[PDB]
Amino acid sequence: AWNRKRISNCVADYSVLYNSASFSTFKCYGVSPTKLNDLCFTNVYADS
């Protein structure tokens, strides 16, 4: 019963993910997670 959320018309970042976060596994498919900044998505969902 995961939670589906909506990220719309705002700005994300990647540099605020790993500075002392030290999470278990961070990875991305079809694009390097390092360059999340330059890429530009549309209608980002959030499932947790």
Partner: protein
């Protein structure tokens, strides 16, 4: 309305104020709007 099932965009514009007077009379003001949709992005224009 009844309720809202889902909502891909929500929004509040800039603050401004209203007269809120029921007194009878000729229209002392004027308002114009041009609603339009181009290439998937909504827009609006106005003048007082």
């Amino acid at each position: 309305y009844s309720s809202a099932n889902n909502c891909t965009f929500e929004y509040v514009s800039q603050p401004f104020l209203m007269d809120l007077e029921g007194k009878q009379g000729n229209f002392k003001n004027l308002r114009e709007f041009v609603f339009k949709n181009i290439d998937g992005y909504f827009k609006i224009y106005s003048k007082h």
